Amino acid sequence: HWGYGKHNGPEHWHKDFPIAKGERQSPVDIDTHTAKYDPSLKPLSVSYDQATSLRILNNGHAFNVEFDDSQDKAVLKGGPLDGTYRLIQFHFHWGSLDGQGSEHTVDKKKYAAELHLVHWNTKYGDFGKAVQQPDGLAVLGIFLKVGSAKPGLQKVVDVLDSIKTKGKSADFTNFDPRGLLPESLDYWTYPGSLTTPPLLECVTWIVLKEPISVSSEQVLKFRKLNFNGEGEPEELMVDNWRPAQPLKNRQIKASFK
Numbered sequence: 001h002w003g004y005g006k007h008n009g010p011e012h013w014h015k016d017f018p019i020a021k022g023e024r025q026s027p028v029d030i031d032t033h034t035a036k037y038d039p040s041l042k043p044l045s046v047s048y049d050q051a052t053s054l055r056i057l058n059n060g061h062a063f064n065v066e067f068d069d070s071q072d073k074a075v076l077k078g079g080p081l082d083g084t085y086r087l088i089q090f091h092f093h094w095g096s097l098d099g100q101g102s103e104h105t106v107d108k109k110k111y112a113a114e115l116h117l118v119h120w121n122t123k124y125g126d127f128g129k130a131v132q133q134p135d136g137l138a139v140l141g142i143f144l145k146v147g148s149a150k151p152g153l154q155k156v157v158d159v160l161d162s163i164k165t166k167g168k169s170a171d172f173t174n175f176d177p178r179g180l181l182p183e184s185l186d187y188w189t190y191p192g193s194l195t196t197p198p199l200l201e202c203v204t205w206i207v208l209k210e211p212i213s214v215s216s217e218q219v220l221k222f223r224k225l226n227f228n229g230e231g232e233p234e235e236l237m238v239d240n241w242r243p244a245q246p247l248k249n250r251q252i253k254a255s256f257k
């Protein structure tokens with residue numbers, strides 16, 4: 001079934017997931033000149049001090065760093081959001097080359113990678129319920145450019161050898177996701193979807209203006225991961241990104257002038 005290759009990639013997804021051609025699909029191009037500053041947008045509130053990471057998993061499409069979301073430990077609120085969203089996992093999308101890899105683009109510019117911190121609205125009780133709601137998820141998206149290393153990313157990079165193939169997981173406790181954030185929390189926001197199947201239209205996207213810098217060696221190690229399972233022919237996990245989708249009847253709002 002679905003993946004990122006010629007025969008099962010983004011152009012094919014609509015056959016099993018017709019919502020692929022829906023009215024609020026993600027990612028999108030962020031046209032910075034058309035985005036409107038909204039002075040009524042509140043600052044983001046990122047509360048990750050009590051975050052409890054548990055595990056890192058190669059799921060055959062990316063790797064997820066998973067958190068304990070059974071309590072309000074790591075939460076996102078404020079910004080465009082009403083209520084409290086719990087961090088459940090983060091993952092990345094990245095390219096085979098430094099000039100591609102992000103899902104969102106900025107004035108059509110592609111970054112080397114994009115970090116997604118996935119949160120669900122606690123008023124819906126669990127993640128599975130939340131993805132069935134138009135305001136069920138808040139995903140914080142952060143662009144990665146290649147330059148200096150991101151020290152807070154290195155513990156992720158160093159465990160990737162142990163989860164090379166699909167279905168492999170490793171203990172990944174005591175990781176602090178605060179080390180993945182840029183200085184500024186200025187953001188764009190719009191209503192959208194999951195960027196992989198099932199492509200559900202349940203996401204409030206919050207995309208940070210300021211990218212983080214990662215080193216060429218760090219992203220190189222992302223690209224050594226495998227889509228395949230152990231004992232199967234090696235296919236490098238690269239270019240696991242969906243391209244920009246039609247904006248249709250949506251406005252992107254900016255928290256900043």
Ligand SMILES: Cc1ccccc1-c1ccc(S(N)(=O)=O)cc1
Pocket residue numbers: 116118131139193194195196197198
């Ligand atoms: C992969 C998956 C399975 C069931 C429910 C949600 C997901 C999912 C898909 C995409 C994202 S993204 N890349 O928009 O942050 C997050 C979760």
Ligand SMILES: [Zn+2]
Pocket residue numbers: 091092093116195
């Ligand atoms: Zn993602």
